[PDB]
Amino acid sequence: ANPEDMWRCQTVNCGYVYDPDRGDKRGKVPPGTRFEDLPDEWRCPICKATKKCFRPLAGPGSTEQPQCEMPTD
Amino acid sequence: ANPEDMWRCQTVNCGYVYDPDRGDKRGKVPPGTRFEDLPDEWRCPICKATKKCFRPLAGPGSTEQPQCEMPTDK
Ligand SMILES: [Fe+3]
Ligand SMILES: [Fe+3]
């Protein structure tokens, strides 16, 4: 719901947003699943980045640079 | 950056979100541009969908499958 618990994939050519109220069909994640509670083997359904490539939409994390393994910035 | 202002590409296997606070670097859209004010010819930077394939993350239109020139998903 709120931008604070939505997370955007930061790789350079992506832009998927994980929405907890939607879940994630391609990753078999049911609606209501918080970003923290995602499996450890979960990847971005678009670009397949790990969750280290994601950033909350607003609030403190949203201005930090994520510890991401694929190209970003 | 409220969800009613964010727009999700519903093309099959896409899901890029236009966040008006970000703008769109590939589209050369400066930050602060509302989705409603995007250029006529503006397209999804990932899948080339027109704006008619997008829907807001909340509010009227957020629940229905967009109808456009690409195959879309619900
Ligand atoms: Fe991604
Ligand atoms: Fe798209």
Side-chain angles (χ1 to χ4, degrees):
Chain A
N2 282 165
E4 339 310 340
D5 20 28
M6 309 187 109
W7 293 67
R8 196 189 173 90
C9 184
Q10 291 305 298
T11 81
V12 56
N13 276 20
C14 194
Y16 179 80
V17 176
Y18 179 74
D19 177 359
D21 296 336
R22 162 194 193 85
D24 156 26
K25 275 143 216 71
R26 280 160 287 180
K28 324 282 180 342
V29 165
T33 305
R34 293 218 333 298
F35 182 83
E36 286 76 4
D37 287 328
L38 292 167
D40 340 291
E41 85 153 64
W42 181 90
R43 312 297 208 80
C44 180
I46 294 183
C47 75
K48 292 289 212 198
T50 72
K51 76 213 280 174
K52 273 155 9 159
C53 294
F54 284 75
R55 214 163 84 168
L57 288 198
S62 87
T63 73
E64 254 43 57
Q65 171 126 227
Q67 33 180 126
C68 169
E69 77 279 346
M70 297 167 47
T72 52
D73 280 271
Chain B
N2 277 46
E4 326 74 55
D5 307 297
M6 301 195 283
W7 290 71
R8 182 165 197 286
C9 180
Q10 291 307 124
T11 284
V12 166
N13 296 0
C14 190
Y16 172 94
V17 173
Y18 182 76
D19 185 331
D21 291 358
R22 282 190 79 256
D24 166 31
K25 288 302 100 213
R26 281 166 289 182
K28 310 301 183 164
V29 170
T33 302
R34 290 161 63 251
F35 187 81
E36 303 77 355
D37 299 317
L38 283 175
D40 282 352
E41 59 267 73
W42 181 95
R43 287 171 183 272
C44 181
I46 298 187
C47 77
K48 311 194 220 74
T50 71
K51 295 189 288 161
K52 295 176 325 282
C53 305
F54 285 62
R55 38 159 196 81
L57 286 200
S62 62
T63 56
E64 309 104 47
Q65 151 188 232
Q67 158 184 174
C68 69
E69 83 282 353
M70 319 273 261
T72 53
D73 257 349
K74 248 246 16 80

